[PDB]
Amino acid sequence: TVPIAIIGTGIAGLSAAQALTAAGHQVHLFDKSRGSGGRMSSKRSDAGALDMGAQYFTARDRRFATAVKQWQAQGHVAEWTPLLYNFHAGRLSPSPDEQVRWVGKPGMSAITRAMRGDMPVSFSCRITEVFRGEEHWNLLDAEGQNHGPFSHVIIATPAPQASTLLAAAPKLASVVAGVKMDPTWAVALAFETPLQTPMQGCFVQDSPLDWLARNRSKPERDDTLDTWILHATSQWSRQNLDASREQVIEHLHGAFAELIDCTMPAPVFSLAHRWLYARPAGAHEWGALSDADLGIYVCGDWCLSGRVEGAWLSGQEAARRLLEHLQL
Amino acid sequence: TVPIAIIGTGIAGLSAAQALTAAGHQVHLFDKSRGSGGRMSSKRSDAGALDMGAQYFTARDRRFATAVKQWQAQGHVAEWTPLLYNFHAGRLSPSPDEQVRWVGKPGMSAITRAMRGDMPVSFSCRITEVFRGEEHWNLLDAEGQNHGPFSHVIIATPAPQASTLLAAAPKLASVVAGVKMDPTWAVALAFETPLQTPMQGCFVQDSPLDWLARNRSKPERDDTLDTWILHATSQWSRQNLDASREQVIEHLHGAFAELIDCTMPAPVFSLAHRWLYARPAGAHEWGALSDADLGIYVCGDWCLSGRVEGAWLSGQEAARRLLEHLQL
Ligand SMILES: Cc1cc2nc3c(=O)[nH]c(=O)nc-3n(C[C@H](O)[C@H](O)[C@H](O)COP(=O)(O)OP(=O)(O)OC[C@H]3O[C@@H](n4cnc5c(N)ncnc54)[C@H](O)[C@@H]3O)c2cc1C
Ligand SMILES: Cc1cc2nc3c(=O)[nH]c(=O)nc-3n(C[C@H](O)[C@H](O)[C@H](O)COP(=O)(O)OP(=O)(O)OC[C@H]3O[C@@H](n4cnc5c(N)ncnc54)[C@H](O)[C@@H]3O)c2cc1C
Secondary structure, X not given: OOOEEEEOOOXXXXXXXXXXXXXXXXXXXXXXXXXXXXXXXXXXXXXEEEEOOOOOEOOOOHHHXXXXXXXXXXXXXXXXXXXXXXXXXXXXXXXXXXXXXXXXXXXXXXXXXXXXXXXOEEOOOOEEEEEEOOOOEEEEEOOOOEEEEEOOEEEOOOHHHHHHHHOOOHHHHHHHOOOOEEEEEEEEEEEOOOOOOOOOEEEEOOOOEEEEEEHHHOOOOOOOOEEEEEXXXXXXXXXXXXXXXXXXXXXXXXXXXXXXXXXXXXXXXXEEEEEEEEEEOOOOOOOOEEEOOOOEEEOOHHHOOOOHHHHHHHHHHHHHHHHHHOOO | OOOEEEEOOOHHHHXXXXXXXXXXXXXXXXXXXXXXXXXXOEEOOOOOOEEOOOOOEOOOOHHHHHHHHHHHHHOOEEEEOOOEEEEOOOEEOOOOOXXXXXXXXXXXXXXXXXXXXXXXXXXXOOEEEEEEOOOOEEEEEOOOOEEEEEOOEEEOOOHHHHHHHHOOOHHHHHHHOOOOEEEEEEEEEEEOOOOOOOOOEEEEOOOOEEEEEEOOOOOOOOOOOEEEEEEEOHHHHHHOOOOXXXXXXXXXXXXXXXXXXXXXXXXXXEEEEEEEEEEEOOOOOOOOEEEOOOOEEEOOHHHOOOOHHHHHHHHHHHHHHHHHHOOO
C-alpha cells in the first residue's frame, strides 16, 4: 500500500500521524535526527533527563486539552506547579498560578515518544528533495537514497527548513520562506549543592536571560543533582549566535549568578545548546498550509501560536485537510 | 583576514570566486558533491568522460566571450561541429552551420576544474544553515559541524536549494523560493559498434526525446566506444520524474531507435541521471540577487538566461556587488 509521508517527528507531524492513523490511513514518518521529539526533546545527562527545549505547556483548546487529558491518564504527562518568580531589578515572585502548566512525565520527550509509539519511522534521514510524477510522491535524502512511492506528503518542520522541501510548489514555498524564526541559546548547570532558594522558575527582563527553570522540581525528575536550565533572550541569542558553547556557558551562568541573592557553587557540569529556529518571531493564523490538489501539506507551531498546542493543532489541521480532500 | 564564503562550485560560483580572488580577497568554496562543476560536470564511464549535463555553449556577451577565448588558449575549451538534424516531419537534416558552439576540452568539466585551481575548497560538505553573528557569517553542514568565520556569503546554487540557505534574509528567500526549475532526464548509451548514421546531434519533437549528441564527435573525446547522450524533453521528464533508471533508459532508448534509419546494437552500457533542477523554467533579468549590508549574495544561471553564459555572468555580477560594497 502507498502510505502518506510525514517529514518531521516533532509534535506537529506526530499529531498529523495520529489523526491520519485514527482515521485508518497509513503513514511513514521521517526525521533527520537519531530520534523523535524535535523541539520537545529531552537530554539525558549526569543529572537524568534535562528539558532544554520546550519548558512546559498550556492548553487553551478543548480538543488539545482532551489529548492532554489522555496523555495524563497514560502517565506521559503531569502538572508542573513550580514556585515561579519574576525579575524587575529584583526577584519578586509573580504567581500567575491560576495558570496550569504541563510537562512530560519522566521528561518532556515522553509525550512525543508515546505519540510515536509504533508508527513506521525512518531516523537519521535528512530529506532533501520532494517531487512527484503523475503517480506518486518521492523523497530523496542527503545520501541520494530514494524513498517512496507516497500518496501525499506532510512537511512538519520549522518554516526555513520546510522551504527546500517545497520546490514542487513555488508559490507555497514563497509564503513559507517569509516566516521568521528566532533562535535561543540554552545552557544547563548542575550543582552538587541545592541552591538555597525556594525558586523553581523565573521570568526575566533586563537580562541576557529570558527564562530559567529548576529542572529537578518537575514531577518525576531525578532528584540527585540540582539542575537549572537557562534560556537566553532572542536578541542576546541573535547577538551571540556565533559564540562558543563555553562562552555562552560563561555569560548565561554569569547572568544567573548575578540575579539570585544566594551563593552559587562550582557546577558539577554545564551544557550548552543553540536552537537556531527555536520559536516563530511572530504569531500566525494559518493553522496549516496546503496545495491539496498537488498533494503536499505543511504544518507546525509557526502556523499558529508557536507553542506546543499550536504545533499539535497544526498537525490535526493538515491531516483534517488531507482526509477532507480524499473525496477527491 | 576572514575569508568570503561561496556555496556551490558550479560555473556561477567559481566565476564569482575568480573575480574576488583576482582582486585579492580570500574565498572558501563549499560543495555537497565530491567534485566541482555542478551541471557542467562530466561523468566518468567505460567510454571515457561523458557530458551528461551541459552539452555545448555559445558566447553572446562580450566579456563572457573574452573569457572563453582565454580558456581556449589555455587548452580547456575547443569548438565543436555537430552535424545537426531534426525529428519533426521524419528526421530531416536541419542545421545552424551558424551559431558557433563551445565545449570543454577533455570533457565539459575541464572548464570549472581549471577555474577552481588550488582554491581552498571543502567537498562532500552540504551546507544546511547560514547564519550571522554580530560581525561574522557562519555555516552549518549536514554533519552539524560549524564553518567560519566568514566575512560574507555567496550562495551559488539552483534557486530551490538556496531558499533554505537564505533564512537570515527572508525577503531574498521569498524571491528565490518563487523560482521554478525544470527537470531533465539524461541517458547515456555506449555502442560497441558505431551507429550507421553520419550525424552527431539532433533536435526533437513529438517524442519524449529532445536532444542527442554523439559524444565522440566532440574534440578530444575517447574513440573506442560510440557513446550517445540523450536528453529528454522537460515536459516528459516531469511526467516521468518518479520513474526508475531502468524505465527511463528503456523509453529514451526506445524513442532513439524509433527515429534513426539504421541498425542499433544493444548498448555495451547505459546510464541514466535525473537532473531535478536542470534549467530555470523562464528567463530572468536580475543578474544577481542580494542584500549587501547583510553581506549575503545570491547568483546562478537562473538569475539570467539559464545557460552557461548567464551562470558565468551572474557569477561576475555577484562579485561585482560585494566588491563595490567594500566601499564600507
Ligand atoms: C528552547 C525552546 C524553548 C521553548 N519553550 C516552550 C515553552 O516553554 N512552551 C511551549 O509551549 N513551547 C515552547 N517552545 C516551542 C515548542 O518546542 C515548539 O513550538 C514545538 O515543539 C514545535 O513542534 P513542531 O512539530 O512544529 O517542530 P519540531 O518538533 O521542532 O520539528 C520536527 C522535526 O523536523 C525535523 N526536520 C527538519 N528538517 C528536516 C528534514 N529536511 N528532513 C527530515 N526531518 C527534518 C527536525 O529534525 C525535527 O525533529 C520552545 C522551543 C524552544 C526551541
Ligand atoms: C541536462 C542539462 C543540459 C544543459 N545543456 C546546456 C547547454 O547545452 N548549453 C548551455 O549553455 N547550458 C546548458 N545547461 C545549463 C547549464 O548547465 C547551467 O545553466 C549551469 O551549469 C548552471 O551553473 P551554476 O553554477 O549556476 O549552478 P550549478 O552548476 O547547477 O550548481 C553549482 C553547485 O551548487 C552545489 N550545491 C547545491 N546545493 C548545495 C548545498 N546546499 N551545499 C553545498 N553545495 C551545494 C551543487 O552541488 C553544484 O555543484 C544544461 C543544464 C542541464 C542540467
